[PDB]
Design a protein around this ligand. Structure first.
Ligand SMILES: Cc1ncc(COP(=O)(O)O)c(C=O)c1O
Ligand SMILES: Cc1ncc(COP(=O)(O)O)c(C=O)c1O
Lengths: 391, 391
């Protein structure tokens, strides 16, 4: 007999890591593949962070640590939230985790009960619904359009809330759209959320530093009165090109943070001790390397957006930040008679070798997520191929 | 209003990491504290493993990897299981995780349904019941005595099994007793397990290399016919003094391993990329550093066991391996009128500064777990203090 799988894992299907595995596979066969599906910076970890990790290895920092992070890193997080976000957190409000993904997963396991509804704006990071489902929560998707710049409004939010709603993910700047809410937009959402006090607000600020159209702002900057029911989710993966090291961090209400620490203490223990020391050097160091990387993404974005605009049948909303852009190819799908954006993306990959992620993976049919965390020369080639495929 | 906690997290209370935090705290106040509660080797990570990690950092191995491990590490695990354990696994049967704790936690989340019973022999590693409870499983504890050398027998196992039993943890050599089953003992347990085919066998071989009284053997060496319903859990934390790096690995039935990979893909993504490269160097390198460390634990064990034997009111069963020994202080508790082994351990810490873990944390009242992952000079001091306290 085959080993049966738990009912909870039968609820879930990760297509971003799956495209990555298919792209690596077809490159392994020797084919001419350009990967526009990546979810990490192409830049290496900055040298001063690498040097701090090497110093930690040489010093023998190879042991278990406090589950929620060495005190130097919890302090660096505390100071970062004050310095960058004008938010005051005590050490017992801070949890360092194995990537920001684990912050989110620990949150769901520490907080959500079976049947609880979680508002997830589309387009959404692929993992939000699956993490909710693994806690037996119920994803409640709010669909958005380009005319709304892929952002929910206060009337959509109120309409989606029920007496069963206990959480919302607010991810700004967004994976996959690259769009960020303005402070006033967050204020209008906060005014709705103030009317529903059982809703915990999970603000996923992972892409905070990767923004150029406006200064970063989150729900607590807009609505300080929501502090006691908000958890702030962040990490070093994107700002410091540290995706492989797996360090995220969160700040929020002490009882919730302690419950998340309890989940973590029974699942991973502390994150890698060397990675923790690397993250101290990142958070306490200069922003110079951040600015270098964000400037690169900005110039690449403007190039890609211009190329997409010029391709007949592709409609695009320019991003505010991140290394993603999220154009609609629905007109190409319709003129070709493709079934959907999965067929579009499979045909594109097999015809011209460009790998990207179908918009339906993020809950928005007919779009595609293009990542420009690759060199501008590779982007010129890839957009040439996309233009030829769509011609 | 305080943020409420999920019902699942209200089910759980980690006391090994808690003693560690209290010991570090009292040392911080400047007090004369000896920590005999540690759960990791005192030796640093071997130099050749450190050098491989540094080489990976310098090479820019700082990106996301396959969630279940880079192919070089999955291959090293495959070869390790064949070389050490005469077990044949394909790559799709292997999962690298964030510590062996995450292997165990992923297993529970991928496999256990609410109400499923899990047999957990006492004394048990503190995390087994809590990981089961977080999947809404039901821990079913089998209590053992020193006259049984803290090992279950086939009649106890059969009596504990019900139609609801779907899993058993078999941890040999044991945390906290240090005792290992013989091959024939595992054969007798396997004969019971063959009569109950819905029971998945989770053999936690983390302490495999840290053994001296007999060659290591597990349930599949004893009973090869259980291969299709056994998951083998192991890791580099103990054998290579790598606890801070967080690399575990497991091998078992492909559908189950894939479901565990699904949980991992929605919780942590891949383990730290640098740590994965370090683990490749460990598994593919010489056993010389393992033997050096295990020889040290062996000589320290024999010293500690002899000192414990000489203290009136302490009864001890010598360990077969690990860096733990698990004597009973019940006679001290009774002559003093202490309430239990928690009171014993608190009084010992406050009177003479020796920190250790009460046996009730592992489900065996009246014992204490002493770790000898510290230098022999510190052990002489600590045992002197214990002798004075117990006098
Ligand atoms: C919106 C969002 N949140 C969180 C994460 C988690 O990233 P990591 O687990 O590498 O910290 C990601 C992925 O990069 C993301 O896109
Ligand atoms: C019995 C047992 N299994 C698994 C583990 C997991 O160790 P780690 O998560 O560091 O790999 C431990 C702790 O060291 C343990 O004692």
């Amino acid at each position: 007999m085959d080993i049966a799988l738990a009912k909870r894992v039968q609820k879930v299907k990760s297509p971003t890591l799956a495209v990555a595995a298919k792209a690596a596979q077809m490159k392994a066969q020797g084919l001419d593949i350009i990967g526009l599906g990546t979810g990490e910076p192409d830049f290496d970890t900055p040298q001063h962070i690498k040097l701090a990790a090497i110093s930690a290895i040489e010093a023998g920092d190879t042991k278990y640590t406090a589950v929620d992070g060495i005190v130097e890193l919890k302090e660096a997080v505390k100071n970062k939230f004050k310095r960058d976000n004008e938010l005051d957190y005590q050490l017992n409000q801070i949890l360092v985790s194995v990537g920001g993904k684990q912050s989110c997963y620990n949150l769901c396991q520490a907080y959500l009960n079976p049947g609880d509804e979680v508002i997830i704006p589309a387009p959404y990071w692929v993992s939000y619904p699956d993490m909710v489902l693994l806690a037996d929560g119920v994803p409640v998707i709010i669909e958005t359009t380009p005319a709304q710049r892929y952002k929910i409004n206060a009337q959509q939010l109120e309409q989606a809330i029920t007496p069963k709603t206990r959480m919302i993910f607010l991810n700004s700047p967004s994976n996959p759209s690259g769009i960020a809410y303005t402070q006033n937009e967050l204020k209008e959402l906060g005014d709705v959320l103030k009317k529903h006090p059982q809703i915990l607000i999970a603000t996923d600020d992972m892409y905070e530093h990767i923004i150029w159209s406006q200064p970063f702002t989150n729900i607590l900057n807009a609505c300080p009165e929501l502090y006691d029911r908000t958890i702030v989710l962040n990490g070093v993966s994107k700002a410091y090109a540290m995706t492989g090291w797996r360090i995220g961090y969160a700040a929020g209400p002490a009882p919730l943070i302690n419950a998340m620490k309890t989940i973590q203490s029974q699942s991973t223990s502390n994150p890698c001790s060397i990675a923790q020391r690397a993250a101290v050097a990142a958070l306490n160091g200069s922003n110079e390397s951040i600015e270098e990387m964000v400037n690169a993404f900005h110039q690449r974005h403007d190039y890609v957006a211009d190329r997409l605009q010029s391709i007949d049948g592709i409609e695009v909303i320019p991003a505010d930040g991140t290394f993603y852009i999220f154009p609609s190819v629905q007109a190409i799908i319709e003129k070709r008679g493709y079934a959907n954006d999965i067929e579009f993306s499979e045909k594109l990959l097999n015809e011209v070798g460009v790998a990207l992620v179908p918009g339906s993976a993020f809950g928005t049919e007919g779009c595609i997520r293009i990542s420009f965390a690759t060199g501008i020369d590779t982007l010129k080639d890839a957009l040439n191929r996309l233009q030829r495929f769509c011609s």
